[PDB]
Design an enzyme around this catalytic site. Structure first.
Site, PDB file in Angstrom:
ATOM      1  CG  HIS A  41      12.193   7.796  -4.247  1.00 33.61           C
ATOM      2  ND1 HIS A  41      11.033   7.563  -3.534  1.00 33.61           N
ATOM      3  CD2 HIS A  41      12.543   6.603  -4.791  1.00 33.61           C
ATOM      4  CE1 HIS A  41      10.705   6.283  -3.634  1.00 33.61           C
ATOM      5  NE2 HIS A  41      11.602   5.677  -4.390  1.00 33.61           N
ATOM      6  N   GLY A 143      11.763  -2.040  -7.095  1.00 34.21           N
ATOM      7  CA  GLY A 143      11.071  -1.765  -8.350  1.00 34.21           C
ATOM      8  C   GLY A 143       9.565  -1.578  -8.162  1.00 34.21           C
ATOM      9  CB  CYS A 145       9.041   2.913  -5.759  1.00 32.68           C
ATOM     10  SG  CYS A 145       9.983   2.489  -4.265  1.00 32.68           S
TER      11      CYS A 145
HETATM   12  C1  LIG Z   1      18.362   0.848  -4.643  1.00 34.12           C
HETATM   13  C2  LIG Z   1      17.078   1.473  -5.108  1.00 34.12           C
HETATM   14  C3  LIG Z   1      16.849   1.686  -6.574  1.00 34.12           C
HETATM   15  C4  LIG Z   1      15.693   2.247  -7.002  1.00 34.12           C
HETATM   16  C5  LIG Z   1      14.642   2.642  -6.019  1.00 34.12           C
HETATM   17  S1  LIG Z   1      13.124   3.372  -6.650  1.00 34.12           S
HETATM   18  C6  LIG Z   1      14.853   2.444  -4.655  1.00 34.12           C
HETATM   19  S2  LIG Z   1      13.618   2.889  -3.426  1.00 34.12           S
HETATM   20  C7  LIG Z   1      16.128   1.833  -4.194  1.00 34.12           C
HETATM   21 ZN   LIG Z   2      11.942   3.670  -4.735  1.00 33.98          ZN
END
Ligand SMILES: Cc1ccc(S)c(S)c1
Ligand SMILES: [Zn+2]
Ligand SMILES: Cc1ccc(S)c(S)c1
Ligand SMILES: [Zn+2]
Lengths: 306, 306
Positions: A41, A143, A145
């Site tokens: 993602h 951040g 992830c």
């Molecule tokens: C709002 C948002 C921005 C970056 C990521 S990696 C996610 S999971 C959600």
């Molecule tokens: Zn994410």
């Protein structure tokens, strides 16, 4: 002598964390040899997440759509592919800090250490158990992830989790290092929610054995029980049914303490029916289910206090 | 989003752990630049420990009475001296993995990460709070002496604890990195025991703020209290008295949540008098006192859920 939820030393993994940016999104990646692994993602925008078709979104990217930063150095991507829910980026440099490692898919009830990371920089480490409902009760902020979970044996790092999302109840979901999600979750916006959970019986038993090894026997009793009679009580208290495989696993702990597994089950049954009467076990006022039989043998003395 | 007792990534410290042997005793040492620090009792035999005179036992050793092993390499000692309860061994090699660091003497109530080590090999990492009674509830087995505690700020490692002993109740005692013991303990065999302990009030308040930041307000109430009226209840439940300095420290958390400190004290007073009625806070059934206001700000989101 104490008993703590301890994590594995994280150094070998810290040397593998990097930052991966695509467009306006930045998250963490895992750099092993000449490959960087990260949540797929990272290629999505907020709107994309509503109903993303990753195959379609990805074919639209080039190798240079990806920016990989290791510390203060920029890594050049020379290839990319999608593997289930992860992206595998080939880079021009092999990580010189790569440890001996392997990818393993952990089973429900098992534990692992999580190295929380932001912008490719490790910030903290703690131990988590994969719950029966396939989520983990981690501590993660935006951040995080791409942060990974692992176990260490000798000097081999077995990576088993990569972080991808937080569910409505505040618990977390992710994948193994082949990109397959633990649980029925998906990397997109839906009404998905953690299913019902259950207490990990085998672990609670392991922990009661740890308490005896450490010198405490107050909760033991003179009764025994049958596996079936135990399971009738377990069902009532939302404990996973105990199986003969679980009994076999507890063999070594049972032998070190001289307490038969089913006799320890009788002790558990009584603790569940009568409560703990204001007492504690290994410092806890509740029954702990996040330590496996393996964790106990690893941390406790090999000699019971007696 | 979760809340866990998390430790600092341990890599920077793992690269500093070595093994130190004198005679038949082997324990862990900390190698920074060209110095190795370790518990001075490494020079003692079992009998020596009954009433050791370290000055006398040490003058009888030479530089080569000490064997220092870093990984698979042998370090040569070219000097040695005693500093309070530690030995400082000068070695022929400067540690190339030495991180930016400093030695700090932590105060009661503060927290730090412990890297449990055996034979100079790191085995686990967990977070501990220095209790008001100057002990820590660690998890240590024979061979863990010399394991260290630390905090990390930016990329500077502040070492604050070196492990030396276990007391009768299973809790642990040690020194700062200048060799001065935390508490009235001594490195020898005596009838010494951990004194009475108390709950760390400031930390329990910090943790209630963390619970609100994470979206939970069930335990709040419409009352307020005076510092003095709060302390009458604290004394009854064996909580440390709250001071105006503690109230000032909670300022930022109070501002992020919009809950006045004394109003949060009113909430605590009620939790102490009425119990938690089968409910939990941040997953806990008891009031947690091992998270400082600093730990909370470090781990929690800077935006309250509201
Ligand atoms: C709002 C948002 C921005 C970056 C990521 S990696 C996610 S999971 C959600
Ligand atoms: Zn994410
Ligand atoms: C029995 C024994 C052997 C070695 C050490 S370092 C200690 S504290 C106790
Ligand atoms: Zn010792």
């Amino acid at each position: 002598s104490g008993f703590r939820k301890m994590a594995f030393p994280s150094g070998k993994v810290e040397g593998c964390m990097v930052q991966v940016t695509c467009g306006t999104t930045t998250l963490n990646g895992l750099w092993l040899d000449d490959t960087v692994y990260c949540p797929r993602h990272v290629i999505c925008t907020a709107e994309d997440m509503l109903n993303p078709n990753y195959e379609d979104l990805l074919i639209r990217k080039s190798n240079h759509s990806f920016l990989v930063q290791a510390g203060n150095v920029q890594l050049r991507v020379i290839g990319h592919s999608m593997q289930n829910c992860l992206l595998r980026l080939k880079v021009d440099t092999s990580n010189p800090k790569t440890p001996k490692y392997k990818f393993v898919r952990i089973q429900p009830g098992q534990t692992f250490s999580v190295l929380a990371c932001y912008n490719g920089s490790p910030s903290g480490v703690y131990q988590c158990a994969m719950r029966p409902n396939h989520t983990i009760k981690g501590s993660f902020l935006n951040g995080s992830c791409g942060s990974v979970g692992f176990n260490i044996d000798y000097d081999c790092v077995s990576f088993c989790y990569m972080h991808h999302m937080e569910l409505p109840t505040g618990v977390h979901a992710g994948t193994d290092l082949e990109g397959k999600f633990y649980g029925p979750f998906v990397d997109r916006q839906t009404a998905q929610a953690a299913g019902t959970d259950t207490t990990i019986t085998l672990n609670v038993l392991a922990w009661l054995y740890a308490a005896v090894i450490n010198g405490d026997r107050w909760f033991l009793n003179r009764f025994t029980t049958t596996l079936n009679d135990f399971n009738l009580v377990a069902m009532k208290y939302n404990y996973e049914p105990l199986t003969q495989d679980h009994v076999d696993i507890l063999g070594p702990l049972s032998a070190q303490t001289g307490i038969a597994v089913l006799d320890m089950c009788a002790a558990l049954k009584e603790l569940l029916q009568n409560g703990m009467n204001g007492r504690t076990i290994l410092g806890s006022t509740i029954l702990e289910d996040e330590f496996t039989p393996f964790d106990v043998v690893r941390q406790c003395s090999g000699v019971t206090f007696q």
